[PDB]
Amino acid sequence: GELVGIITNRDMRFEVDQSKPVSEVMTKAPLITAKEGVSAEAALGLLRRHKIEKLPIVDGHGKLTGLITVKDF
């Protein structure tokens, strides 16, 4: 139940071997994530600073509890 990475279409596009597992392509942790209760503005600032479109939201124990995208803004 712990977050160990993320896989997006920029990774999958630049990958040819379809039979590959996710573990060989994904961006492995530590990811750019945020904690519960983060304001929208701070999440937007983090997405702007790190030039990413997805921000996993995790709890106190590292369990994934949400996902914020810049597409929603």
Ligand X SMILES: Nc1ncnc2c1ncn2[C@@H]1O[C@H](COP(=O)(O)OP(=O)(O)OP(=O)(O)O)[C@@H](O)[C@H]1O
What is the contact surface with ligand X in residues (CB under 6 A)? 6, 8-11, 27, 31-32, 51-56
Per DSSP bridges, beta strands 27-28 and 34-35 are unpaired
Residue 16: contacted member of ligand X, a second copy, none (CB under 5 to 8 Å, by partner type)? a second copy
The residues binding a second copy (CB under 8 A) are 10-11, 13-16, 47-49, 51
Question: Comparing C-alpha atoms, which of 21, 23, 26, 20 is closest to residue 7?
Answer: 26
State the Cα–Cα distance between residues 26 and 63, nearest whole angstrom. 18
Cβ contact 59:65 at 8 Å: yes
Residue 47 interaction partner, one of a second copy, ligand X, none, beta carbon < 5-8 Å per kind: a second copy
Query: Least Å distance between CB 64 and ligand X?
Result: 11
Nearer to a second copy, 10 or 63 (CB): 10
